[PDB]
Amino acid sequence: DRGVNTFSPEGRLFQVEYAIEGHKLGSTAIGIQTSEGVCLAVEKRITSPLMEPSSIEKIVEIDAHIGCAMSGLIADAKTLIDKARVETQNHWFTYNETMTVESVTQAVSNLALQFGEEDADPGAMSRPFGVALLFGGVDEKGPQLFHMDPSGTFVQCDARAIGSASEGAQSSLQEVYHKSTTLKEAIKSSLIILKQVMEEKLNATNIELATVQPGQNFHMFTKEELEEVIKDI
Amino acid sequence: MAERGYSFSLTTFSPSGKLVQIEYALAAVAGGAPSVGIKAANGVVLATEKKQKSILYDERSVHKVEPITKHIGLVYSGMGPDYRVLVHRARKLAQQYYLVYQEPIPTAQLVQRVASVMQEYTQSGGVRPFGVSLLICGWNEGRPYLFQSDPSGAYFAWKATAMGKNYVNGKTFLEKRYNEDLELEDAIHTAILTLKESFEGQMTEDNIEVGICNEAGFRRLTPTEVRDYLAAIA
Amino acid sequence: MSRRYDSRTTIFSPEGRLYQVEYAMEAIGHAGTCLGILANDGVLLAAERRNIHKLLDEVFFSEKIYKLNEDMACSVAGITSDANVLTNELRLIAQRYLLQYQEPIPCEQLVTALCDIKQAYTQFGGKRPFGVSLLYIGWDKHYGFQLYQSDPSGNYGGWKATCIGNNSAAAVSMLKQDYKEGEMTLKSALALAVKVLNKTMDVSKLSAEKVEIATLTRENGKTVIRVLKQKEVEQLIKKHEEEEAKAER
Amino acid sequence: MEVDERPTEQYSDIGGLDKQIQELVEAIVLPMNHKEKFENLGIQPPKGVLMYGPPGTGKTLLARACAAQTKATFLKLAGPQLVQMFIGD
Amino acid sequence: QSTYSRQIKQVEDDIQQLLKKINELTGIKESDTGLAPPALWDLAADKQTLQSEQPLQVARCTKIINADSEDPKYIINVKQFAKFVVDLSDQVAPTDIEEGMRVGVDRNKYQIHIPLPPKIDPTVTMMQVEEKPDVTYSDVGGCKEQIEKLREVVETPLLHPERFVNLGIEPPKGVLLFGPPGTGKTLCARAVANRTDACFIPVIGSELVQKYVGEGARMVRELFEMARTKKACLIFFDEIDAIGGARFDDGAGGDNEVQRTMLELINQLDGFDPRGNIKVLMATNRPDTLDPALMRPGRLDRKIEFSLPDLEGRTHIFKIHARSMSVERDIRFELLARLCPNSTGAEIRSVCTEAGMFAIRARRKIATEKDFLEAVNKVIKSYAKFSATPRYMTYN
Amino acid sequence: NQYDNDVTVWSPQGRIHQIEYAMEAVKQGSATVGLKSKTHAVLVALKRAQSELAAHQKKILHVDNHIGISIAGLTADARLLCNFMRQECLDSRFVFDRPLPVSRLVSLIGSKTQIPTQRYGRRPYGVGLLIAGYDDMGPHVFQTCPSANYFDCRAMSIGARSQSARTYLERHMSEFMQCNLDELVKHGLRALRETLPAEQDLTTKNVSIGIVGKDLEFTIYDDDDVSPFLDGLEERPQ
Amino acid sequence: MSYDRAITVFSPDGHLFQVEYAQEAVKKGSTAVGVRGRDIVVLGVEKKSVAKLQDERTVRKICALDDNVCMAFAVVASVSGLTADARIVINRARVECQSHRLTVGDPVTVEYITRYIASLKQRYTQSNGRRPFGISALIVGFDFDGTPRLYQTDPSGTYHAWKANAIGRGAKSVREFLEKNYTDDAIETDDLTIKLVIKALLEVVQSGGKNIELAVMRRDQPLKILSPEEIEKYVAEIEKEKEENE
């Protein structure tokens, strides 16, 4: 086909630069790291009032103590989560300790660029991934939020938002949040940017929030407990 | 280390009951060497153009008339390398039959199995099917038989057919002409006359090569003998 | 290069479907026709050989209809070349299932399994899908007498009278018109089979050399698959003369 | 195309690549005036010089500059100009 | 309505036929167009008929050749396309007859009666330059940094070359404009042209490439020369992916056409004489999709950045677009700006306008806050989606 | 175009265009300085972050407690080579039990990164590694490219306008072997600023430090554990 | 999985050419609506194309992936018939379903199938010879909790829980026609769900209940595919009803 080895004279891939535009049409995800937990926010994308928030999630379990909220292209997120889930469970038998939020993000980051037009294998691709994932979980070093992106780089962040506008959703988050603060203020800060960047506005079946504290397991929130977080936008 | 290159289909269906690239292969056998085959009904005789038109030919075993086994012989028209593999494969197939049955491979069967590789090479990318067509003889069922296997992999059943230069014209002349109930000696005489009609230029005995299949078994006629037949008839 | 061509074999086209799959159907149109008809106590296959030539020796008396098993039969509609490979795969599948099953191979079961291979190539492997639609006739206990039709597209169909190969639209209607659901018995059906072949050919005049007729009739304790000799078909060619009158009347 | 000098853009606009400057001044300017010497030695005066390299090196820079300074009879021809929309005119 | 439409159809047909006769017949009815003030002019007009200097034939001076033997020789091309050599004007200056200058020459004697205003030597170059409007900064969104560089590079050296001497460089021969489309680059470009008092000549790359290549070559050279006559000018080459596209020539494609036109432009950039204080401005998607061969970086100078509005960046454009417009609102400029995703400036500008069209729908005549809210939701979806080719397989 | 994306079209110099692009990829990536002594090896790398409410990504990666690597370029391409370097070093340690020389390890990496340059339709990687190691001979800083070509240097700097950093390094080349662990870092800091504009010097949170030896085990200093190694720098030597 | 070109190359649109082309390939497997009841979760398909010389089994868009999970397919388009390309997604889906029964022997979950399918499509992208997919499935089945499930998946790789969803001939359009028809009564009453499926199919197809074949699946009993003849009886009443909601 038309070049999939394509470098610019600056020295980056055109194809990677193309990958971001896909994320922008997709879903919106907020991850905030708190001292007192990690809270994860994600767009459910309502479009009927018949879609049940308790039965279906897009906050999903990597481990029983670790969560990941997805953004951008949905199909692409699933492939990264299934390899990451096994790596995590295999880690638990062997070490007998929960996997660092950083440890899982590094593994997925390998997949992002390895593409080429021909000589492709499962470890390689025909075009780079356009999803950014927010892996949030509590480990022995404390609550951490690590951020993985389409360029296949891992960075520690105490607040990252990626969605309809990646940089836009992160600039709203830069104004509100402060580094060290209470759980309710972090949960409030995640919802608040979310409705403004989106076309869609804040409801209790519009978005999905689940919170991981340290000393707790991953809990996906009940119908009532999802509605409690809505009162403070 | 590793090779790729060409692995997508190279062959596209044409509405004619055949693909484009195989149709072109059949022209290749036409520009191939003249080979004639007539079933005499008491053996089959097959005759082929010995030459590759350098006219230095010194054959003692390097023939294009080859015994595969006890009662199967092959003469071809078209490509040399493509043919050598079919001969090597044929012995392995004949023997494959010889192990199970304790008789070698009937004409029909040998054709089914050779035909499957020739098609294989079509559908697959990075390969091309043979440029060879076979005149296959055999004695099975208590009757001599002669089959034509084309470079496509299709088979056409023939009691007499001609290949090489003017093959098309060759088939119509045989379809009308073909004979049966022929003595062994006569079998050679008819076969040489048909070869005269396909093949141009000089014939002596280092220009044409003849092999016969009968009850005793397939063998390949000595250059002295061919000459005596050639002279005899008008 | 290889990166500057198109053939859209594994790649989907603007159509939403591959070129290679659609083209295979065109090749099938101008190649000899195969039909299978249902009778009350058997099933039969009748086919037009790919040989339009005036002289055949009959080295292989299966040049269209090959009997795979003692429980099954097939026809070829398309190119004889892709058939050769397929014929060899069929002698193994048909007998393997039977070793295990000890019951005459179900007509449906066979086709779906085969159709899976036809589709496998077009989707992956970078090979084109076989240029041959195979018409399977068989009998199993839990559907009864059957005819199933195979495509290069991986489409299967449960039929009682169908025809594939050349001028198929005409042919299926012509089999429906003469032969309704469950109407016609095995002998009278063999006649009907030749009558449609005479009309529909790539090149006219129906002869013993151009046709091969196969019967599945259940004999005393065994289901017997025979390909009829030229001699028997000839008695049906006169029967086919009688049949033309009979359809009309 | 008719003679009238084209300006100097000077050779003291490019420093370095000295060796290359010497080759251009010898090649182009000398056989033009000094044809007698090219004949004396025994050679024909060139049928031209091709200046090639990567863009921006000063391939054109030296030729135009040197030619004015020396005083020469300068024809201004441009390759794309010569091609026209009428066929083989 | 089938029976009702026939009645109406016949009645018009008859009335329409009758009209043809009336119109033709009436005419202007043997009147004179000139009226009363031209009567005195008729008498003049007759004197002129007798005279040999009238009528003049327009021509153009092609070339200056001296082998003088009367008064200076010039070869002109007559518009019957016979070349004739004429001589210095009967009383007018030799400094008015120049190469590429128009001249009026007698029809009966062929000598220069009077020279005329210059240029008519190309047919095509005259066609390629089009009308010029002015739009001002008010109308073009943003006071951003991206906006600021366009002015500094274009306005300052041409307006005052003094500043550019002080620094110790020449005013740019070349200038590069880059940034993806749908940002108001052309709009900004119009806006600096008025301030600078530097004439902008718009040019289209699509006219330059043509079936047979060579027309575009002569056109480009002639175009530089015209601009060179103008003092402190800009030749703005808009929408070019001919003089703007990839460097490559297939050698049986339309790519041949591109390569001749580019190649002359390189010759022009350096010049037959240099181009201090003359700017050519070129618009490309980004400088990496522009030639490394046509880009010979010293001459081109500064590359002026324009980039796709940011979320903050679009908050800024939207206040300008809104303020310029007459609108009655309750909701604020920032909210709606964050509401939009990162896409283009163009969707966000259309919101301001679409709210006015919803007002007519709503049965108001000016916008309101609810019209505004409605406009973001429809606009983001509409323009972005339902576009673009669904393939990027098997291209060069 | 498409003759520059082919890994089977070459220049008349005999250079494949795809290898040429692949070297530049390093150069757009952030500057890293790697130095050696005769007791230690120091990796100083320049960081980046997405936001002010974030900590910077370690560009120093942990392999073993005797060998350590620092990346400049694409992280995802980096991670495949990283999975390869960890696999070989650990192998060496189980089977041979020698605290692997740098010099053997880089040559094998050179083989792998060369494979896509020969493959049709596959792009070369475009990340630069300065691999710091300590074996029983002493420390070595080897630099491996996106091509096979690998360097044994006393000090090297790769990235933007990296030639300028080498000049500082060459003036203090001898000194490096005498100096201490603490100083080797400070001389690294002073090289790293030469690459960047003279309008800017380093700060505490854009410096990552990776220290290597077997007189010490491997350490990564992040954004605030950087400070003790950082003190002692000169603002833009020209 | 062997080719010599990439299967797709990326665009700055952020669409995959092959997944969108696949969506049309799955509307070849015609229109399918499924509604979730209290105890019977029902899906029905468009066209059986009856000529009484055929079998009804062979054209089915209803495929049994297990004996307690079943699905009907489509997505968007209007393009020509062909069961076959869709049938291929079923053949992968049926292994996927069956491997889970080996792992968890209770009636296998809908969620598992949908998730595996989204990831399965991305994976095919990566291999140069493998043809991607992009389909929607109406997954019907039961959990080990005995509660009804109707799930649906999309070419965008995303699966959602629903009380009624329809796919085919404009996915959003058949779905919206059901949104009107839905009331709170509908889902608990067993009788009411069946009528919803038949009104949606009756729109795009002429003379249904010969081109409407639907299956009910139950908490305790496996897949039952109803005869067409008993479905026609419903179609006649229900078509009276369909005009009323409009």
Side-chain angles (χ1 to χ4, degrees), chain E residues 172-188:
Chain E
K173 312 184 194 173
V175 171
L176 287 160
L177 201 57
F178 74 92
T183 56
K185 290 160 61 205
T186 307
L187 212 72
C188 187

Side-chain angles (χ1 to χ4, degrees), chain F residues 36-228:
Chain F
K36 70 100 177 291
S37 196
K38 206 51 171 179
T39 304
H40 291 305
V42 158
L43 292 166
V44 185
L46 180 72
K47 321 192 76 186
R48 291 290 186 100
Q50 314 182 118
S51 61
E52 44 161 347
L53 282 165
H56 292 221
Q57 165 197 215
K58 59 172 183 194
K59 308 292 182 162
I60 307 290
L61 289 181
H62 199 326
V63 188
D64 305 312
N65 298 129
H66 72 310
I67 71 110
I69 56 170
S70 53
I71 64 182
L74 309 184
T75 296
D77 294 286
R79 182 60 60 205
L80 183 58
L81 285 163
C82 187
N83 294 161
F84 201 70
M85 283 182 263
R86 61 191 68 181
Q87 177 182 299
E88 279 175 294
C89 294
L90 268 82
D91 194 297
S92 185
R93 299 250 52 178
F94 174 70
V95 197
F96 309 78
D97 203 8
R98 170 190 194 185
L100 189 53
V102 194
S103 302
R104 309 206 313 188
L105 197 268
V106 283
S107 305
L108 279 296
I109 310 160
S111 302
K112 169 175 183 289
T113 182
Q114 188 260 18
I115 321 176
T117 71
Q118 314 188 277
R119 274 177 181 135
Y120 167 60
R122 183 56 178 286
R123 51 164 280 258
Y125 310 128
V127 44
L129 301 298
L130 278 143
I131 178 157
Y134 193 94
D135 40 271
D136 297 43
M137 197 265 208
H140 305 306
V141 47
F142 269 66
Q143 189 271 317
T144 299
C145 305
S147 46
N149 191 219
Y150 53 77
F151 294 66
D152 183 16
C153 310
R154 297 167 205 247
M156 204 172 189
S157 290
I158 35 158
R161 309 191 298 155
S162 72
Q163 275 57 271
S164 48
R166 295 190 200 127
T167 304
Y168 185 82
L169 299 158
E170 286 173 89
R171 285 179 289 185
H172 291 99
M173 57 195 163
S174 54
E175 170 192 65
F176 303 140
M177 296 72 210
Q178 294 94 238
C179 84
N180 304 276
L181 179 283
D182 312 271
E183 284 189 75
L184 198 64
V185 173
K186 298 165 182 164
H187 309 132
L189 318 175
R190 292 175 180 142
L192 177 50
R193 51 193 67 223
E194 302 305 81
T195 51
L196 292 168
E199 294 291 356
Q200 64 175 80
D201 308 299
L202 321 165
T203 180
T204 193
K205 299 195 82 178
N206 62 9
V207 167
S208 43
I209 306 290
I211 54 177
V212 188
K214 281 186 97 60
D215 176 63
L216 54 84
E217 280 169 288
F218 192 89
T219 333
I220 307 177
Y221 304 110
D222 288 30
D223 293 295
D224 317 281
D225 311 85
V226 191
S227 309

Side-chain angles (χ1 to χ4, degrees), chain B residues 16-219:
Chain B
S16 201
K18 280 187 192 185
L19 305 105
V20 66
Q21 300 304 118
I22 51 179
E23 288 169 56
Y24 297 165
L26 304 169
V29 292
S35 301
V36 69
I38 68 92
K39 156 188 147 296
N42 298 88
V44 178
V45 47
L46 303 181
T48 197
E49 171 190 71
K50 195 182 277 193
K51 65 180 201 172
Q52 322 182 114
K53 80 167 202 70
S54 289
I55 58 166
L56 280 322
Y57 290 84
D58 206 33
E59 264 40 85
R60 305 117 190 232
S61 59
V62 234
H63 323 321
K64 299 159 175 285
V65 185
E66 261 301 313
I68 317 307
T69 195
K70 299 161 176 59
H71 66 261
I72 319 191
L74 267 54
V75 327
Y76 74 117
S77 173
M79 308 199 187
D82 282 325
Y83 184 56
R84 291 347 297 229
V85 96
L86 283 166
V87 173
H88 195 50
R89 161 169 190 88
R91 299 145 171 195
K92 297 201 179 300
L93 267 36
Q95 296 282 317
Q96 200 161 294
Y97 238 64
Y98 186 54
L99 276 45
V100 44
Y101 285 98
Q102 206 74 352
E103 179 165 300
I105 196 148
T107 31
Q109 285 302 105
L110 179 88
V111 169
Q112 176 81 294
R113 304 181 173 187
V114 293
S116 42
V117 283
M118 304 172 173
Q119 87 60 238
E120 175 172 67
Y121 299 139
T122 311
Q123 163 171 244
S124 293
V127 274
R128 40 163 294 275
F130 296 156
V132 170
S133 213
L134 283 180
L135 285 161
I136 41 267
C137 63
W139 175 292
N140 50 101
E141 319 177 30
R143 216 261 182 93
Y145 282 110
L146 184 153
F147 225 167
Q148 176 178 296
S149 308
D150 288 70
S152 294
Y155 30 79
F156 289 138
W158 286 98
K159 294 187 174 280
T161 192
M163 299 169 171
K165 307 182 183 69
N166 291 57
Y167 73 143
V168 278
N169 169 59
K171 290 182 150 59
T172 67
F173 179 91
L174 293 171
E175 183 164 80
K176 278 68 187 298
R177 290 256 313 206
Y178 78 118
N179 305 96
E180 301 187 54
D181 185 57
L182 293 171
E183 162 62 38
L184 306 190
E185 304 299 288
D186 294 334
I188 319 311
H189 290 304
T190 314
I192 216 72
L193 185 43
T194 56
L195 192 55
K196 201 185 264 169
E197 305 295 285
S198 47
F199 174 53
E200 51 67 62
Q202 61 288 120
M203 293 168 73
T204 41
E205 46 187 66
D206 311 313
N207 288 115
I208 68 304
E209 195 163 63
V210 184
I212 195 164
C213 193
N214 53 80
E215 299 81 28
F218 191 114
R219 45 64 63 78

Side-chain angles (χ1 to χ4, degrees), chain A residues 6 110 118-119 154 156 158 179, chain F residues 5 53 55 57 80 120-121:
Chain A
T6 29
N110 184 36
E118 314 172 29
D119 295 278
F154 70 115
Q156 177 187 134
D158 61 284
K179 296 190 174 293
Chain F
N5 289 313
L53 282 165
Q57 165 197 215
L80 183 58
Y120 167 60

Side-chain angles (χ1 to χ4, degrees), chain D residues 1-5 73-79 81-84 89, chain E residues 63 99 221 272:
Chain D
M1 302 180 199
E2 287 213 318
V3 289
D4 174 63
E5 57 177 350
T73 33
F74 202 110
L75 297 75
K76 300 168 168 158
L77 195 66
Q81 197 44 70
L82 284 170
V83 297
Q84 290 292 293
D89 286 25
Chain E
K63 181 175 184 177
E99 168 181 315
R221 179 173 182 161
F272 291 112

